[PDB]
């Protein structure tokens, strides 16, 4: 146990500093040490109970406190990275991914800060499921099932409930499409994701005023919703809205992904071309930090 603990620590030190911002090879170092000494225990030591126990204790010792954990001065840097690794696996065949997630599980069984990892993974799963960038949902369901078997019952039910929420929203969209199929379709297509507030970790943002270009449509849909279901109200989050743009002016056709903020800024250019920060700030009351981040994203 002492030798294998020092060996895992030595491997992590040999990595040292490039593992703060790259979770893949940190988790892979941990897994390489674990697999080497697990094979050694199974073959040479006849799969004895005490020797596997020593393996488990040393592995759990060097996972939770190592070079990057000390450097960040937070043991929660160990599950966080693991969570990020999961995200890296589930962005946008099946057997390889399933084996990789089982390896993620054999790492995760040694995590003592399970709530930190679970909160990180819940927020990342929410960010994934909201708009786009999700792999085959078979993998996500299998991940939720593995968390079911490993952890308790309530948190995985929370995750399954937000999955059921996205499914219910998809079913409502299908119902709306069916309703429009046997009627007169509108001039434009509207898509919404109706999500439970309790299950999703989102927070209310700054107040925003709807422009006059969509007020009539919004009022009409609100009246229709009240007629169909007067007992439910929609808390609109304009910060998380999306948008696709096609530039039909060049020889080649491009696709641009941008939010409503981008289109509002572009629509503001119909009158002037050069904009002063002070004028827009006084007119719209926008904090310096958020617009600075927006400009940095624009430049990057």
């Amino acid at each position: 146990e002492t030798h294998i603990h020092n060996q895992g620590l030595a491997a992590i030190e040999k990595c040292g500093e490039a593992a703060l911002n790259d979770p893949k090879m940190y988790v892979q170092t941990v897994l390489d040490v674990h697999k080497k000494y697990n094979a050694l225990v199974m073959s040479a030591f006849n799969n004895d109970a005490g020797f596997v126990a020593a393996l488990d204790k040393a592995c759990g010792r060097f996972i939770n406190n190592n070079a990057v954990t000390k450097m960040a001065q937070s043991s929660s840097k160990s599950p966080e990275l693991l969570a990020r690794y999961c995200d890296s696996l589930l962005k946008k065949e099946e057997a390889e991914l399933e084996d990789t997630l089982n390896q993620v599980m054999v790492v995760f069984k040694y995590i003592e800060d399970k709530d930190v990892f679970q909160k990180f993974y819940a927020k990342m799963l929410a960010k994934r499921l909201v708009h786009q960038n999700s792999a085959s949902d078979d993998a996500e369901a299998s991940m939720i099932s593995k968390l079911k078997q490993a952890c308790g019952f309530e948190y995985t039910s929370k995750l399954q409930r937000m999955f059921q929420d996205i499914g219910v929203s998809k079913d409502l969209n299908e119902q709306f499409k069916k309703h429009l199929t046997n009627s007169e379709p509108l001039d434009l297509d509207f898509s919404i994701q109706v999500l439970s507030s309790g299950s999703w970790p989102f927070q209310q943002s700054c107040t925003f005023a709807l422009p006059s270009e969509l007020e009539r449509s919004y009022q009409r849909f609100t009246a229709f919703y009240a007629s169909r279901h007067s007992g439910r109200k929609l808390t609109w989050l304009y910060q998380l809205s999306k948008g696709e743009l096609v530039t039909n002016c060049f020889k080649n056709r491009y696709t641009l992904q941008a939010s409503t903020f981008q289109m509002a800024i572009l629509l503001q250019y119909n009158t002037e071309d050069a904009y002063t920060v002070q004028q827009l700030t006084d007119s719209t009351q926008i904090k310096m930090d958020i617009l600075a981040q927006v400009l940095q994203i624009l430049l990057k």
Binding site: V130, H131, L188, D189, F190, S191, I192, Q193, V194, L195, S196, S197, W200, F202, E213, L214, G231, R232, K233, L234, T235, W236, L237, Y238, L240, S241, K242, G243, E244, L245, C249, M263, L266, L267
Partner: peptide, 20 residues
């Protein structure tokens, strides 16, 4: 030239009970 049109609008909303 420099003309933009709206075709799709993907929004997000949360539902909660109106009793309280």
């Amino acid at each position: 030239k420099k003309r933009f049109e709206v075709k799709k609008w993907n929004a997000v909303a949360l539902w909660a009970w109106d009793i309280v």
